[PDB]
Design a binder for this molecule. Sequence first.
Ligand SMILES: CC(C)CCC[C@@H](C)[C@H]1CC[C@H]2[C@@H]3CC=C4C[C@@H](OC(=O)CCC(=O)O)CC[C@]4(C)[C@H]3CC[C@]12C
Ligand SMILES: [Ca+2]
Ligand SMILES: [Zn+2]
Lengths: 675, 40
Amino acid sequence: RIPLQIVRAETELSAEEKAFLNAVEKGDYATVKQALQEAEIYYNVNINCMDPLGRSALLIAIENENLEIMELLLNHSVYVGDALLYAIRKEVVGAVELLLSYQFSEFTPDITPIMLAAHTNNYEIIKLLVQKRVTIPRPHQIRCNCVECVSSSEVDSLRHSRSRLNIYKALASPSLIALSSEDPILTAFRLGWELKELSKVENEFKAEYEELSQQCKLFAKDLLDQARSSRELEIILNHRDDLAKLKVAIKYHQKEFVAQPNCQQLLATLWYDGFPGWRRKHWVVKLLTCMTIGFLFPMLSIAYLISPRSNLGLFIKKPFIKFICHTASYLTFLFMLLLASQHIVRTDLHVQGPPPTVVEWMILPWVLGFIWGEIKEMWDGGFTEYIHDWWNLMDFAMNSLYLATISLKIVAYVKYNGSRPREEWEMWHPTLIAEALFAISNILSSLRLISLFTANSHLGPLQISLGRMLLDILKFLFIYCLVLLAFANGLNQLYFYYETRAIDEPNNCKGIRCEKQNNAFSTLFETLQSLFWSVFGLLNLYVTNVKARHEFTEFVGATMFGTYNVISLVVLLNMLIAMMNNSYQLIADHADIEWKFARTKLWMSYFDEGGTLPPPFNIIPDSLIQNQHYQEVIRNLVKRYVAAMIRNSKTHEGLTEENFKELKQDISSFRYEVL
Amino acid sequence: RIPLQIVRAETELSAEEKAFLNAVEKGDYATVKQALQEAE
Ligand SMILES: CC(C)CCC[C@@H](C)[C@H]1CC[C@H]2[C@@H]3CC=C4C[C@@H](OC(=O)CCC(=O)O)CC[C@]4(C)[C@H]3CC[C@]12C
Ligand SMILES: [Ca+2]
Ligand SMILES: [Zn+2]
C-alpha cells in the first residue's frame, strides 16, 4: 500500500486566470480582448499569468503561430522577456520579425538570440538577426592565465564551460560562416582546427567539440563541392592570403577537403605532367615506360647539370619522373648494399683495419647525399615541421649509424696496422662495432621502402591500417613488458642461487644461445632474454632443471614458467588479436580518405624545385585582381550551397505542418467570410 | 566581441517588386493581373 501524493505542490492559479489561458490557447479575437479589458478595469485577471508547465500567454500565442493575438498581447504590455528565443527555436519567420519590430525558462541565461539562431541553423532567421547589428562574444584563447577567465572558472566552472561550448557551437554553424565571414573556406579550416585542438583540452566535453569540428570540415568540403568549372577550382586552390589553399588545408589536416575528386583530378594532372593520359595506357606499356625511365637514372640528372633548360634538362623537373628517378636511385643503393656482403668483392678478412673496398667507395657518395639532403631538410622548408614527420626519425637513425660506421672505420684504419686472425680480436674491436652498425643501418635502409606504399593504389590503405594497428601494438607492449618484468624478477630471484660458470658447462658456453641451454634464469638480463625467447618456443623445458635434487625448487620454477607462458600467450596474444581486429574494423570505413591524403602529401613533396637531383647527384656543386576573382568565386559557391541546403531543408514533417497551417488559415478566412 | 555583418551584400529589389513577388507566392488571380497591368 504505497500512498501517492504530489510532494512538490505547485501554486495553481485562480479560475479567472484559467479562462484567460484557455481563451489564449484556443484562439479567439473577442474573448481574449474582453478578458484583457476586464483585467484592466476590474483587475480580475493577472496579465502575466503563467502555467505550471512553463507556458505563459505569450509563449502559447507563439506556439499557435497566430500574429493577431501576439500583436494584441504586445500592445497590452505582456512580459516579453525570454520570448524571442522561443520563436527563434520554433523557426517561424513572422513571429521573430514581429517580436523584433516591437522566473522559469527553458534556456540558460548565457544564450543570446543570435546564438540560438546560429544553433538552430536557419538561414532566414540568422540573416534577419544579423541585419539588426548583432554581435557574438569572442571566445578566449585555449591557454589563459588572465583574471577574467581564471576567476570565472573558479567561481562557476559549469556556467563557464557551457558558455564557451554555446559560443563555439554558434560560431561553427554553416549559415553564420556563409553570411558573416568573407572567406568561409579559411574560416571553416581555422574553426575546425581550433575545435579539434580544444576537444583534447576539455577532455570531458570531447564529443561535442569533435562533432563541431566534423561539421566545419563537412561545410568546407560541401562548399568546395559546388564548383562547376576547372577555372573556379583553380582559383579556389591557388588563392594566397603554387597551390596555396591546398597547402593550408593540408596544414590544418582537412582530409575530406583534400580527398575531394576534383582536387584529386587537378593533382593528378599536375602529377602526370609529361604523360597525357597515363591512366589510359595498358599496364604492360606503363610498366615498360616506368622501367625505362628508372633505368635511365644516370641520365636526365647529368643532363640537368650540364643544361638545365634544354629539351632533356626539363624532363626530370616533372614530378612523376622525379619520383621514378628517386626510387631508382634508392633501389640502386639497396642493390649495392646487397652486393657489399658478397665474396666476389670482399677478401682478406683477417686484417685489423682494412681500406674500403670498391663497393663501399661507391656507397659513400650515396651516404653523403642522404646526409646532405637531411641537413638541407632541416634548414630549407623549416625546422618546426621537420620533427613533425615521424619518418625523419628513421632517417636520422640511418645517418647517425652511417656516420658512426665511417668514423669507426677511420679510427680502426688509423690506429690498427697489421693483420690478426679474427678469433683473437677483442670483444670491443672497432672493426666489429663498425660491421655491426653497418648491418643495422642496412636493415633500417631496406625497411625505409615502406614509405613508398602510399603511391600505389593497393598498398596505401594497407600501410594506413598498419599504422592504425601499430598504435595498438604500442598499447599492448606496456602490459606485456609489465608481465615480463614481474615474471623475470620472480624467476631470477628463485633461480640465481644455482648459477654455474662457463668452464664447468660443456663447450665453454653459458647462456641460452648454446646447443645445451644453460643458466637461463641466473641473471636478470638472461632471464629477460629467456622469457622473451619462450614466446616463440625457442626455450627448451630442461632449463628449469638444476644440478642438485631440489625437486620443490624445480617444480616452483616450472610452475612460474608455465604461468608466464599461459599469461603471455593464451591471454595476451589473443587479446592483441581481438584489439587489432576491432581497430581494423573501425578503420576500414575511413581507409580511402586517409590514403588519398597521404598520397597528396607525397605528391606535393615532389612539386617544388628543391631536391630535384637524386641523392647520388645532389652533392655535386597584383593581389587585388586575385582577391576580387576569389571573391566572385566565393559569392557563386555560397549562393549555390545555400540554395542546395535551403531546399534540402524541406522535410515531410515541416511541409505537412505548413500545409495544415495554410489549410486552417484558409478555412478560418472562409468561415469569417461566410459569417 | 566579434562583429557580425553580411559581407556579401545582395542588391535587394525595390518595394514595388516585393508586392509582385508576394502576390505570386501567395496566389491571387486579380492582384498579379493588376500588378502586371501596372508594370506594362
Ligand atoms: C616483393 C619484393 C620483391 C619487393 C622488393 C622491394 C622493391 C623491389 C619494391 C618494394 C616496394 C615497391 C614499390 C611500391 C610502390 C610503388 C609505387 C608505384 O607507383 C605507381 O604505380 C605510379 C603511379 C602513382 O603514383 O599512383 C610504382 C612502383 C613502386 C615505386 C614500387 C617499386 C618496387 C618496390 C620498391
Ligand atoms: Ca626525410
Ligand atoms: Zn582568457
